[PDB]
Design a protein around this ligand. Structure first.
Ligand code: ORN
Ligand code: K
Ligand code: K
Ligand code: K
Ligand code: K
Ligand code: K
Ligand code: K
Ligand code: K
Ligand code: K
Ligand code: K
Ligand code: K
Ligand code: K
Ligand code: K
Ligand code: K
Ligand code: K
Ligand code: MG
Ligand code: MG
Ligand code: MG
Ligand code: MG
Ligand code: MG
Ligand code: MG
Ligand code: MG
Ligand code: MG
Ligand code: MG
Ligand code: MG
Ligand code: MG
Ligand code: MG
Ligand code: MG
Ligand code: MG
Ligand code: MG
Ligand code: MG
Ligand code: MG
Ligand code: MG
Ligand code: MG
Ligand code: MG
Ligand code: MG
Ligand code: MG
Ligand code: MG
Ligand code: MG
Ligand code: MG
Ligand code: MG
Ligand code: MG
Ligand code: MG
Ligand code: MG
Ligand code: MG
Ligand code: MG
Ligand code: MG
Lengths: 102, 62, 34, 77, 46, 93
RNA sequence: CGCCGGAAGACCAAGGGUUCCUGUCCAACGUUAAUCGGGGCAGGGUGAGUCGACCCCUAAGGCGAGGCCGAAAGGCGUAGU
RNA sequence: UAAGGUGAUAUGAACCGUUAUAACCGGCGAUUUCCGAAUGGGGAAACCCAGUGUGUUUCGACACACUAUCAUUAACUGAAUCCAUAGGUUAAUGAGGCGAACCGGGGGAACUGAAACAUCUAAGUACCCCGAGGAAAAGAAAUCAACCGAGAUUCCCCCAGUAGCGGCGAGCGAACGGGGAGCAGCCCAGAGCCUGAAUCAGUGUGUGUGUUAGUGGAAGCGUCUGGAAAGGCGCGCGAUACAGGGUGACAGCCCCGUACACAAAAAUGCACAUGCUGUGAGCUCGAUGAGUAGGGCGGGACACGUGGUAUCCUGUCUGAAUAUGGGGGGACCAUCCUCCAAGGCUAAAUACUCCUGACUGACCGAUAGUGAACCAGUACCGUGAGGGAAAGGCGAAAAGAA
């Protein structure tokens, strides 16, 4: 019932990274996704003497809202919407704009 | 599991219940001596005792 | 009794403090307008 | 309690009314007496706690007819 | 000087404990009122 | 006797301290954390079976849990039973 | 150097409940400062056939099968507990 | 139903799962320590101590079950005392306790008003107690009416602040009759014929519908400002869907939904239909509720305070007639009219909301609204019953400052 899943190619619709593309690392139960190279923050990380990790300005990805991305139709090169239909016995996702199965 | 243990009878289920409680005692001594790294084994053995005792009751009282 | 004082929850009967005729130093010769 | 066993009379409440019509609560008690009744059907005396009006019910109905309504009520004598 | 509260655990439980409240009908209405108010401690017990 | 499934639940942990290590060196005594409603006869029959040693005597005590203030909640740790198990002088562990 | 020493010493009951011991910290708490503490945090510590409880036995008294009594709720009480 | 998961503060560790045995949601099951009616005895609640019977044993001991009181029924026993009864033991079935209001019954104030106060008022209110149900109570004329007629009970609007009652003061306050909601009638006091012909109760099965998880669900980008566009400007599309919520500022077309159309392996509520058990319809004949009706005395209830006071109830003392007879029509008598007490059952219209779901508001917005938007009946106060707070907001994102 989820329209955006892991390992999908998405394009960002809203924000500072609007128009950029990437792959979904994971979906969160908050209704947020982490996309590669998208929504980057700089965390001033404290040192701890266990873990063998020193401090530093670490650059990581922040979670963006799932309604702020769309599935990327690679055939058309555009953001598309997702429907649901029954090909065989089982449910699939398809693109709205050409009715082709994802 | 729960289908491999349905194809045993009551005395073989009594044999496996005692084997699971012996392992549960040995995991306790390793976890309480700082020697158990795989702490996920404690939940697995605990819920397999619950499976065996479930099947023993639905063979006797049924 | 004063049973829900938030300024002084430890005490319920307080007129031995400020009422002059209930203090321990009250003398009845103060009441001489009789 | 002050209950007749045959008729079921019990104390009821009312008023003492004086000449100036002051009202004070009083009770009205039944005229209860303990009496042993001969049962010819059993050669046995049965003691009941009855009112004086309940004695006239027994004199009219008979003691066996009265004791049968006492079993049907579930009263214990 | 000597004050009014002189504690004794036996006299506390015999006077207002749980079995003392459950012994009469008026004590059982104390426990019904305290349950209806939703109190965390019903009686003066251990 | 007893039941063996009862035996497999009595002993919980070995207790680690300086008093627990002195008692093994000088007095030949292991200190164990046992079940709360365990008896001295159940502890003795469990050590002799699950550790395969010979027990001379068992001394027990109940430890009372401490009241700790975590953040602002006023909490309390649980109670536990502690056993001093004296082995015979031809011993192990 | 000074003070108590039929206590201001020692051991308990009652009551309290970790205040006990060790390490560490000094914001707040301590009528001042605090490196110290009955304060904060972490760890440790209470071992019984003979001591005490529980147990057996009863006092005052309580409760009380049946019972007697009472508008109801209940009151008193026998055998007992 | 699914590509993600192992509840929260609250990360981390160690793992599980990805086309179906991860997790999540629903039905039916299993487990369910101790206290509590608490029920084997006891007790300072969450503890102490047993008796009996089976099964085990490594002989030290274990495991399970039963054992409260009362009521009803049955069996076996069994005194003073011959029969007997009382009593005793055992077995089966039921009850017990809790819960916000609503309902019926048993008891029942005072402040207050009367500008004082005693009759009267407050008020059969508050409160205490008993009992029952999903509703309860009431209910099929010994009723009204007025010479014409109506036709069980309950509830609503009139009648009417009228008629009356009343230290005729303060106050209390109908009925007849009319309009509506709803609508329903039966049984015993007994025999014969005909039997099991109506109805009701329980259960089985079938069908229909609903509930307890769910499934699908339309249509938008270009540019400007800006941290960010859902805003401005321009040009399109959907609508049985422009209810609502979210998304970095105000979105029908980004997300969740919404209108609409579908879904049950299993349990269950109604609606029929049918099977079984129990119940028995109909005809004729007969019968027609006695310490009762009424009365005296004392009280109470009727709007009605003893008044000229009918009617109802009864603590006490009495005491009829039996359809050729009785009750009532507001003192009482005559005439006339009307109805059959002293046995019982009964749906709907009515009352209420502890709880569940949906939706709504010229309701509140942190001194407000529940005491409580927050780990609140908490902290704290009190021997106890009981009393009872304060305390919401970084940002879009912790990017919470290496
Ligand atoms: N009975 C004594 C209560 C003491 C209380 N704090 C008071 O001030 O009254
Ligand atoms: K008489
Ligand atoms: K300091
Ligand atoms: K001070
Ligand atoms: K009950
Ligand atoms: K008065
Ligand atoms: K006045
Ligand atoms: K006056
Ligand atoms: K009439
Ligand atoms: K709509
Ligand atoms: K919207
Ligand atoms: K009458
Ligand atoms: K009258
Ligand atoms: K506030
Ligand atoms: K408040
Ligand atoms: Mg010893
Ligand atoms: Mg000991
Ligand atoms: Mg704990
Ligand atoms: Mg000296
Ligand atoms: Mg402390
Ligand atoms: Mg110290
Ligand atoms: Mg200081
Ligand atoms: Mg010190
Ligand atoms: Mg300290
Ligand atoms: Mg501390
Ligand atoms: Mg002793
Ligand atoms: Mg008694
Ligand atoms: Mg009553
Ligand atoms: Mg008991
Ligand atoms: Mg018991
Ligand atoms: Mg009850
Ligand atoms: Mg009653
Ligand atoms: Mg007045
Ligand atoms: Mg009145
Ligand atoms: Mg009824
Ligand atoms: Mg869907
Ligand atoms: Mg069905
Ligand atoms: Mg008749
Ligand atoms: Mg009267
Ligand atoms: Mg008068
Ligand atoms: Mg008349
Ligand atoms: Mg007349
Ligand atoms: Mg508030
Ligand atoms: Mg404000
Ligand atoms: Mg207190
Ligand atoms: Mg306040
Ligand atoms: Mg508040």
């Amino acid at each position: 019932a989820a329209k955006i899943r892991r390992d999908d190619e998405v394009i960002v619709l809203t924000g500072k990274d609007k128009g950029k593309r990437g792959k979904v690392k994971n979906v969160l139960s908050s209704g947020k996704v982490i996309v590669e190279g998208i929504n980057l923050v700089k965390k001033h990380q404290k040192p701890v003497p266990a873990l063998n990790q020193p401090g530093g300005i670490v650059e990581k990805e922040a979670a963006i809202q799932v309604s702020n991305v769309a599935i990327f139709n690679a055939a058309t090169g555009k953001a598309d919407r997702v429907g649901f239909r029954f090909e065989d016995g089982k449910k699939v996702r398809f693109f709205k704009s050409n009715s082709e199965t994802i | 599991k729960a289908k491999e243990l349905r194809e045993k009878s009551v005395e073989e289920l009594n044999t496996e219940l005692l084997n699971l409680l012996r392992e549960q005692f040995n995991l306790r001594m390793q976890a309480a001596s700082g020697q158990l790294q795989q702490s996920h084994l404690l939940k697995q053995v605990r819920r397999d005792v619950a499976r065996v005792k479930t099947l023993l009751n639905e063979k006797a009282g049924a | 009794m004063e049973n829900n004082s938030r300024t002084m929850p430890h005490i319920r009967r307080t007129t031995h403090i400020m009422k002059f005729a209930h203090r321990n130093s009250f003398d009845f010769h103060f009441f001489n307008a009789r | 309690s002050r209950v007749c066993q045959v008729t079921g009379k019990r104390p009821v409440t009312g008023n003492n009314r004086s000449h100036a019509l002051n009202a004070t609560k009083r009770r009205f008690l039944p005229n209860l007496h303990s009496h042993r009744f001969w049962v010819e059907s059993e050669k046995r005396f049965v003691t009941l706690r009855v009112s004086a009006k309940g004695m006239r019910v027994i004199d009219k109905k008979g003691i066996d007819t009265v004791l049968a309504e006492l079993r049907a009520r579930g009263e214990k004598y | 000087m000597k004050r009014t509260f002189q504690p004794s655990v036996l006299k506390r439980n015999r006077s207002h404990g749980f079995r003392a409240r459950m012994a009469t009908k008026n004590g059982r209405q104390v426990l019904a009122r305290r349950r209806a108010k939703g109190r965390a401690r019903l009686t003066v017990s251990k | 006797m007893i039941r063996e499934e009862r035996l497999l639940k009595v002993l919980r942990a070995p207790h680690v301290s300086e008093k627990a290590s002195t008692a093994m060196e000088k007095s030949n005594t292991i200190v164990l954390k046992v079940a709360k409603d365990a008896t001295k006869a159940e502890i003795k029959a469990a050590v002799q079976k699950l550790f395969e040693v010979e027990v001379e005597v068992v001394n027990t005590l109940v430890v009372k849990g401490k009241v700790k203030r975590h953040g602002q909640r006023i909490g309390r740790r649980s109670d536990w039973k502690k056993a001093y198990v004296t082995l015979k002088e031809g011993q192990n562990l």
